[PDB]
Amino acid sequence: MKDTDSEEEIREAFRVFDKDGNGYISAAELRHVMTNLGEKLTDEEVDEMIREADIDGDGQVNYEEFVQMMTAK
């Protein structure tokens, strides 16, 4: 309780995008919550927004990969 950012702050923000509670956030999970405010990411925009969120698997995001896209960016 002093000088800290709560490592949990991201533990939840992660599921905020991972609604399938499977462990990895799919592209639809990123375009579904990213538009919860109005933004409408298109397909060529989601796959590209994912390529930077994940490290280099196939095109999915995870908790350790979502952490970098959560705080920074």
Side-chain angles (χ1 to χ4, degrees):
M1 244 217 212
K2 238 135 152 201
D3 45 79
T4 175
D5 258 50
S6 251
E7 268 170 40
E8 291 128 79
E9 242 239 55
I10 309 116
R11 264 289 211 87
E12 297 146 302
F14 174 73
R15 243 180 58 157
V16 167
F17 284 87
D18 192 67
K19 303 260 124 178
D20 263 326
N22 62 297
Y24 282 91
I25 293 169
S26 79
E29 283 290 350
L30 198 90
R31 137 175 27 107
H32 188 85
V33 180
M34 272 213 194
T35 180
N36 70 347
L37 300 128
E39 309 215 331
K40 239 129 284 225
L41 269 82
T42 176
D43 279 341
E44 275 149 353
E45 163 68 283
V46 164
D47 299 35
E48 203 128 275
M49 294 252 135
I50 284 206
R51 94 168 279 217
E52 327 187 282
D54 74 334
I55 308 164
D56 177 52
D58 44 295
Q60 73 185 209
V61 172
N62 203 236
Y63 180 64
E64 179 90 12
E65 318 175 306
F66 165 81
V67 164
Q68 288 222 255
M69 172 255 299
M70 192 273 207
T71 33
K73 317 307 292 302

